[PDB]
């Protein structure tokens, strides 16, 4: 009980993750799809 307990209070910080990592991915996939690897990572860091 108590390990699923803080289990739970993991994903409340999940929440205060899920949007900004949703964004560096939602762009991932709409505008870097062209580009090699290197400006890809490039690309990211920069969002990052």
């Given at each position: 009980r108590e390990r699923?307990?803080?289990?739970?209070?993991?994903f409340k910080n999940q929440?205060?993750?899920i949007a900004g990592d949703c964004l560096l991915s939602a762009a991932f996939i709409a505008?870097?799809?062209?580009?090699d690897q290197q400006?890809?990572?490039n690309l990211?860091?920069?969002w990052s």
């Open positions: 699923w307990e803080k289990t739970s209070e993991t929440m205060s993750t505008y870097a799809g062209y580009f400006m890809r990572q990211f860091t920069t």
